[PDB]
Amino acid sequence: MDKKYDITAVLNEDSSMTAISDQFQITLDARPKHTAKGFGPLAALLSGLAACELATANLMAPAKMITINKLLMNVTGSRSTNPTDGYFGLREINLHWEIHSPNSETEIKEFIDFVSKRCPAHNTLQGVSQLKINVNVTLVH
Amino acid sequence: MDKKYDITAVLNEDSSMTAISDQFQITLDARPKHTAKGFGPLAALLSGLAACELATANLMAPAKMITINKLLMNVTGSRSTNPTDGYFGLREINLHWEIHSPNSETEIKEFIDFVSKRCPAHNTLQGVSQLKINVNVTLVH
Structure with missing residues (x-):
């Protein structure tokens, strides 16, 4: 149990989600290819x-x-x-x-x-x- | 078995990795906070x-x-x-x-x-x- 991980994702409007780790940020999206953002x-x-x-x-x-x-x-x-x-x-x-x-x-x-x-x-x-x-x-x- | 997924990660120099999904790219780094890139x-x-x-x-x-x-x-x-x-x-x-x-x-x-x-x-x-x-x-x- 030495290595710990702490992440947090938010549901933005337009249903895209942005995840955050320390000072890095990823934007995810479950929408189909033709419209997504990550x-x-x-x-x-x-x-x-x-x-x-x-x-x-x-x-x-x-x-x-x-x-x-x-x-x-x-x-x-x-x-x-x-x-x-x-x-x-x-x-x-x-x-x-x-x-x-x-x-x-x-x-x-x-x-x-x-x-x-x-x-x-x-x-x-x-x-x-x-x-x-x-x-x-x-x-x- | 309707939804399929295809991702491809690559090990770059400087030991950082970049993943690719369709036209999206996320770089991932397992180095500690002080050194890291994603x-x-x-x-x-x-x-x-x-x-x-x-x-x-x-x-x-x-x-x-x-x-x-x-x-x-x-x-x-x-x-x-x-x-x-x-x-x-x-x-x-x-x-x-x-x-x-x-x-x-x-x-x-x-x-x-x-x-x-x-x-x-x-x-x-x-x-x-x-x-x-x-x-x-x-x-x-």
């Missing part, structure tokens, strides 16, 4: 996940001896709007790693498994069960 | 949750006859950096609604139980169980 709520959560993925990898790399030249993740997910389950949440979330690294395959493999076990966000969503996280990586030498 | 991974993640809450509250209000004048949510959470659990994810997440509404308490109480059982984010995280989500609201007339 990330959908779920978009941001998924980006919050991606960022945790990249960050913990960048932090573990040195100890695992992986040298990274380019790192990026593409996240995709889906949920039901008219569920039978009563499960309005994410049912499937897909993480696609793209690593530009001179390190070997088996190396990159164990590395990522390590990061997945290490990123807080991943740890969190790992315990859902109504959710499925699919991971695959593209190693570019 | 939201922390989890901070945005929690914001994404917060914004889903507000967003769904705003979409359910009409059907519930709840008239909302001001709506905002303060989210706080925590995790271990040195766990014995092996769990590095969020152990607790506190949601505090502040609603300015002429509706009665019992009315806001039932409205929130509903918004809760309905925001995708909230549903997703409800399924965790190494995580405790405490909800409390401040109704302002």
